[PDB]
Amino acid sequence: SKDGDPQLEFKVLQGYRDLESEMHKGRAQVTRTGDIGVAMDNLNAVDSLFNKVIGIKNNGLFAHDARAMVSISELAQISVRNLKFDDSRSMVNLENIVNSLKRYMLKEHFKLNNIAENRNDTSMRHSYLQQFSHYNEFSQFNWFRIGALYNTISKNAPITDHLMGPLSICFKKLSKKLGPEGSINLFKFIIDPNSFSRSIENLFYTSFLIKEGKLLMEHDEEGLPTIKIKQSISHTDSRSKEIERQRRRAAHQNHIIFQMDMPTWRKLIKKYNITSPFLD
């Protein structure tokens, strides 16, 4: 758009990226030099860019710029104390302990974040205490080093563990008897005379058991429920059989619509001749 020309937003974004890049280093300068002048100039650097794009509502640069404000604020807060409160004495004091035990630097900066801590920045030594307020987290320091220092010179006490000593002192059986080398339909076990709330056990259960996929029987000449049995892999593991189980989708599918409470049950009983429940 002509108003809020995208060139302005692009240039200010470049400027703020440069500001973030220079802050990433100037954190060290502020912590080392003992003053905060760099961040004080960064204030003007932020303000110029902020004012140069007022009156526009492209908002993607605000979150990152808030980082500059937080960084400058925290650096100022910690630097107010660190400018020598006793202008001549470099004490061995409370903050000395906490900052010193956290100074170890050999890996977690030298070889972790692609950075190097400069060596050159008794009274003057007070200015090297401020390089250890960035952690903001637990796992980024060498706790292994401090732990190892103990038990070596301090504890001077035995440490190990002793030997292991204390350790040293229904239709499934019907199908089985039917056999895979034959073909008997489902109607032989649903024709208990007028057990109208028991016949539907098998029709709705054994309708198209042909789906198993050992062999692909042609389209049924009748289409009504049917059942047949074959022997297949009997492996116990579940994961290893997924490929074989999914293989059996190869069977073709043809769908006729007939699904009702069958046209009369008399034509069913008179092709498999039983009248008592052989099932359980």
Binding site: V92, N93, L94, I97, V98, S100, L101, K102, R103, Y104, L106, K107, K111, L112, T122, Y135, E137, F138, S139, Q140, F141, N142, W143, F144, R145, I146, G147, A148, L149, Y150, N151, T152, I153, S154, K155, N156, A157, P158, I159, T160, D161, H162
Partner: protein, 277 residues
């Protein structure tokens, strides 16, 4: 050198129950790296002695012989604790004891092992990672190394930082002060267990009290109500002297050795009251 070793081989031969007692105390004291009490010792040892067709021995001679035996075999000694209420390094007279070695400490050797552990640090947990099923190295300890736990050195480091922060608190720190310190070290107060510890800071400090590394203080007031302070433990008193913590801060300083002058007395002043020597 063979003569003193044969002396142990002799005295142990006439005193099989001495072998029993020394083995038992070593194994038990190192089992949970904790203190051992007089009553339990005098009960179990006496039961074992009565079992081993011998009556109650003279504990002065037995104590001297145990000190000689374990100092020659392992260099350890069953040091006692000064009495809580009398605020001495008495002999076979105290009520609680703890094992401690008497090995001389060279200022060059242990540096290598501590550096090796601090280097095992770099690759095992790159960018905050952690070892286990994630890390392809099935034997993360590489079939052998000097870390020796990969699980308790963190606990030891937390213990050491707690001890030193108590030290500069002039042996007097409040419950909220240590909470604030731990928060500004990296330990969260929300209660979430530290991943490598599987334990919370309050649990850790109460366990240290159980191990007696630190001593709790109880006080009740109208204006503040319940509030707790902590004091260095007698175990630490017999375990840390001026020279030991001086060498601790000597490793801490990192800078030239020549500036060791004027540091001893400053370190002493930094804590003040720790014991009567």
């Amino acid at each position: 050198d063979l003569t003193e070793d044969l002396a142990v081989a002799k005295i142990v031969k006439e005193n099989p129950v001495a072998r029993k007692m020394v083995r038992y105390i070593l194994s038990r004291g190192e089992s949970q790296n904790s203190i051992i009490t007089r009553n339990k010792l005098q009960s179990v040892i006496h039961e074992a002695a009565r079992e081993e067709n011998i009556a109650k021995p003279s504990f002065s001679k037995m104590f001297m012989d145990i000190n000689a035996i374990l100092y020659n075999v392992y260099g350890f000694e069953l040091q006692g604790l000064p009495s809580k209420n009398n605020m001495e390094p008495l002999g076979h007279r105290a009520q609680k004891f703890i094992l401690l070695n008497n090995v001389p400490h060279s200022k060059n050797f242990d540096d290598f092992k501590i550096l090796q552990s601090a280097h095992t640090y770099e690759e095992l947990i790159v960018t905050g990672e952690y070892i286990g099923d994630d890390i392809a190295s099935g034997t993360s300890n590489t079939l052998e190394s000097k870390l020796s736990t990969d699980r308790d050195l963190v606990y030891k480091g937390v213990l050491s930082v707690i001890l030193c922060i108590v030290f500069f608190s002039k042996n007097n720190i409040l419950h909220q002060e240590l909470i604030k310190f731990l928060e500004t070290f990296g330990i969260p107060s929300d209660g979430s267990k530290i991943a490598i510890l599987n334990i919370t800071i309050e649990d850790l400090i109460k366990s240290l009290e159980k191990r007696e590394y630190i001593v709790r203080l109880e006080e009740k007031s109208d204006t503040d109500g319940e509030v707790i302070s902590y004091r260095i433990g007698r175990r630490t008193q017999a375990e840390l002297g001026l020279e030991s913590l001086e060498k601790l801060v000597q490793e801490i300083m990192g800078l030239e050795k020549e500036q060791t002058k004027s540091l001893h007395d400053d370190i002493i002043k930094s804590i003040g009251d720790s014991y009567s020597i």
